[PDB]
């Protein structure tokens, strides 16, 4: 796995990254992966994450509710055999640092301090609104397109804005975690995941080859996924995704070894469906 870090300067962000690289290979002759006239490329964009001066940050999980000067982590309750989330206040949005997200995934986070939750600074322009983001991280699995060696010959790429490029050949620690085994696992969607809840779960089952007795999806409102269809000269058909920050609480029949990360849903190659493994009590 290669890690690409984009530093921007003046479709969703995931596809933008994916497409930015496809276009690069195209003009650079290596069209053997651009996937001309195809939805997905040959290589797979495992996922994308954003960053600020503090480094990589993630959407605050939806089961973490503000309660006075603290953001309390709310875990699953139970009623008549069904996994539920007890009522405890509206979800206020914001971001969290990778450090904090890790404690949360390990089940060691009870609450997060108010000044620890990050709010991304917007920026109007003429009308259009953008986020004052400092870095964009991209994880790519290259089956043999030589993306790493091509990117390492460029400092600047086009995302029509421009971005400085840095390609590190090493999978990030977030994807190398050792969660252990348990029946109470969770999956944090770090990128929009396209699919029906029931489908995602099945796939999850036939993928970790286990059975799921019960699950609870803590989310908000579907993310509308657009995109352009070059050959059709029209906009892609709208798809609705489970938004980043959503948590799939799962209760396995027989213990499972929780993978640090796992992809689910459609458009995997474009960066969608990146779920990060977690645990709960």
């Amino acid at each position: 796995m290669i890690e690409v870090t984009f530093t921007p300067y003046d479709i969703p962000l995931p596809q933008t990254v994916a497409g930015a690289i496809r276009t690069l290979l195209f003009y650079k002759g290596l069209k053997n992966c651009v996937g001309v006239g195809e939805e997905e490329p040959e290589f797979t964009l495992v996922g994308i994450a954003i960053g600020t001066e503090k480094g990589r940050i993630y959407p605050l999980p939806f089961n973490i509710i503000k309660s006075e000067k603290f953001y309390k982590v709310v875990n699953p309750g139970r009623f008549l055999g069904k996994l539920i989330l007890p009522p405890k206040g509206k979800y206020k949005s914001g971001y969290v640092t990778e450090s904090i997200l890790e404690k949360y995934l390990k089940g060691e986070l009870k609450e997060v301090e108010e000044n620890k939750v990050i709010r991304i600074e917007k920026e109007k322009r003429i009308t259009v609104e953008f986020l004052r983001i400092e870095k964009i991280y991209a994880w790519i699995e290259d089956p043999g397109c030589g993306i790493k060696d091509i990117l390492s010959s460029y400092e600047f790429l086009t995302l029509s804005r421009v971005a400085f490029v840095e390609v590190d050949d090493k999978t990030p620690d977030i994807f190398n975690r050792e969660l252990g085994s348990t029946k109470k696992a969770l999956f944090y969607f770090s990128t929009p995941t396209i699919g029906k809840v029931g489908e995602i779960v099945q796939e999850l089952e036939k993928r970790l080859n286990a059975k799921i007795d019960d699950y609870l999806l803590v989310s908000s409102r579907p993310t509308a996924i657009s995109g352009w269809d070059m050959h059709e000269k029209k906009p892609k058909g709208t798809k609705f995704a489970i938004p980043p920050g959503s948590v799939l609480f799962v209760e396995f029949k027989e213990e499972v070894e929780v993978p640090p990360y796992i992809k689910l849903g459609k458009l995997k190659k474009l960066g969608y469906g990146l779920a990060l493994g977690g645990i709960w009590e």
Partner: protein, 602 residues
């Protein structure tokens, strides 16, 4: 029969409402949502009557009186009074079938308005399409979008079933400090721990709610793929009708105002005529400009000294700008609109208005969006539902009157568009009535003052933000978050207690400012003294600045004045939210900066 508690939840609410270009779409969305709840509650009233619907209280609900009892009722029918959540008691054996009936009725109702909507759109040229290809408008792709847009979630629980008080609440995650005691007092009232759920009704409602939220996120992500093609100009999400058959330009040339509509937004544009032909009613103010122009009866003063002439010189430009001796577009009361939307026949209209502005004053260009929300056994719950039902149907309606447009009032929550000179007063009274209704119960609110050209979806989003992330984020809540979004893009926000409104209205400071650029530099210098903590201290700094900008007619009068302004400032400071005195001074003066803005309050 066999007692069962049942909860109904309809979504999406705010996302649907926000998808509006015109105030009419906003009202329609809100109203339609209320109609959906009605279509759902009728399924229960047909089988059990209004006595088994705990919330909301249908008793005096206009929708219930006009559509169920068929009575003939006035314009009060135009206000949405039904929220998107409801609680009723049904036959446990009936539950599951009721969940199917309610889903089908809402689903059938929408498909119906859609079909009616498509006929209307063609028979009235909203969409200029061949007689033939009009049938493609009801193909499956479009029916899917209509059918799957809303998500009605119904969950229920047996009231008779017995369970261990503590074990049930602990497992649902409700063991608070309160709940722990409450339960105890319930075990005291009865030598037992294993009771029937209806014994812990309160906690039952909350569990039912959680059960309900689980249900919604399983049902709302089931949407189907959508055909590729150009999207709706109002919402940007769903496929625009015919959006898959034409290129972008050909598609827009087929719609009124060149704005391609998706199935939902079409129902949206059609909903007003439907309600009108079914009740003979329609909202008094159709656009935000209509509300904006209520400021100091500006509109009414213009129609009594320039109305006839304006309409006349309007035809001279084009017979289209008129209809029934009135202006077709309320925004034709502005100069700028003519210098944008027979060139020489226009130069006249402009100059006519320009002069008129010099005589009665420039036309109001800003309006206010007011949103309010409550802060924080069964039969007693019913009594509550009724006090709220009555407060929202009669009292709220009562204070708004005709000074603005009351769109929604589902109990302890409110949505209304008002002219800027009536916003603070209306909001305050509503809060006051709310307090009296319970002789306590706190209410928070957000008021966003915005220019008539600001996209409505964004204004609605900022108003919600003011409410949820400003006002409700204040410890102890019961706050009004006032936000002024100027056209230039400058955005001023101030968090105050409800009493600041009263104190400010009856103050000398208020009179003194409404007659002063003295007030403007007073506000600037003070704000500049509170960017950081003033070395000389808040109190001393205020006196210094007060002496600096406040003066009367003579040594004695100005001595009295400075003394009173300062005192009123300290009082006002009592009602400004903030973590310290500098934040309060800043907040109070930002508020003052807002209400003394000449463009907004000409």
């Amino acid at each position: 029969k066999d007692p069962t508690l049942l909860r109904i939840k309809i979504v999406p609410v705010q996302p649907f409402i926000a998808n509006s270009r015109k105030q009419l779409d906003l009202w329609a969305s809100s109203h339609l949502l209320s109609m959906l709840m009605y279509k759902a509650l009728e399924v229960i009233v047909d089988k059990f009557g209004p006595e088994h619907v705990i919330y909301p209280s249908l008793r005096d609900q206009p929708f219930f009186l006009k559509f169920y009892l068929g009575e003939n009722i006035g314009d009060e029918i135009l206000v949405a009074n039904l929220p998107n959540k409801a609680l009723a008691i049904v036959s446990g054996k009936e539950a599951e079938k009721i969940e199917e009936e309610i889903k089908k009725r809402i689903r059938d109702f929408l498909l119906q308005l859609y079909r009616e909507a498509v006929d209307w759109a063609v028979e009235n040229g909203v969409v200029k399409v061949d007689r033939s290809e009009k049938d493609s408008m009801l193909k499956e792709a479009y029916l899917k979008i209509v059918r799957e847009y809303f998500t009605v979630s119904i969950t229920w629980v047996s009231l008779s079933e017995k369970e261990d008080i503590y074990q049930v609440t602990e497992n649902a995650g409700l063991s608070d400090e309160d709940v722990k005691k409450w339960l105890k007092f319930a075990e005291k009232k009865e030598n037992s721990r294993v009771l029937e759920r209806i014994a812990i009704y309160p906690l039952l409602v909350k569990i039912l709610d959680s059960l309900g939220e689980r249900k919604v996120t399983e049902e709302r992500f089931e949407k189907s793929e959508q055909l590729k093609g150009w999207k709706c100009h109002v919402c940007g999400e769903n496929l625009a009708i015919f959006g898959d058959m034409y290129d972008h330009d050909n598609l827009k040339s087929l719609w009124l105002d060149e704005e391609p509509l998706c199935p939902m937004c079409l129902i949206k544009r059609y909903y007003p005529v439907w309600i009108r032909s079914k009740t003979g009613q329609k909202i008094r103010f159709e656009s935000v400009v209509d509300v904006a122009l209520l400021y100091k009866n500006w509109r009414k003063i213009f129609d009594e000294k320039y109305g006839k002439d304006l309409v006349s010189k309007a035809r001279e430009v084009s017979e289209d700008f008129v209809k029934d001796n009135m202006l077709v577009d309320s925004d034709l009361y502005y100069s700028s609109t003519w210098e944008s939307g027979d060139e020489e026949k226009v130069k006249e209209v402009v100059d006519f208005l320009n002069a008129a502005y010099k005589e009665i004053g420039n036309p109001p260009k800003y309006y206010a969006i007011l949103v309010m929300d409550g802060d924080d056994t069964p039969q007693v719950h019913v009594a509550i539902s009724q006090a709220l039902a009555n407060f929202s149907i009669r009292e709220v309606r009562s204070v708004v009157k005709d000074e603005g447009l009351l769109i929604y009032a589902g109990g302890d929550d409110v949505l209304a568009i008002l002219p800027v000179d009536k916003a603070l007063e209306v909001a305050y009274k509503i809060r006051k009535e709310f307090g009296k209704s319970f002789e306590g119960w706190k209410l928070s609110a957000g008021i966003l003052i915005v220019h008539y050209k600001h996209p409505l979806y964004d204004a609605l989003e900022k108003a919600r933000d003011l409410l949820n992330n400003k006002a409700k984020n204040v410890p102890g809540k019961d706050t009004l978050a006032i936000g002024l979004l100027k056209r230039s893009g400058s955005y001023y926000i101030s968090l105050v207690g409800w009493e600041l409104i009263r104190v400010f209205y009856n103050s000398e400071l208020r009179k003194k400012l409404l007659e002063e650029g003295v007030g403007k530099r007073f506000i600037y210098h003070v704000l500049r003294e509170v960017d950081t903590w003033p070395k000389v201290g808040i109190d001393e700094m205020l006196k210094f600045e007060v002496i600096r900008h406040i003066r009367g007619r003579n040594k004695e009068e100005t001595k009295e004045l400075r003394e009173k302004i300062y005192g009123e400032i300290k009082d006002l400071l009592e009602h400004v939210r903030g973590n310290n005195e500098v934040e309060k001074v800043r907040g109070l003066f930002t508020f003052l900066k807002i209400i003394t803005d000449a463009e907004v309050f000409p």
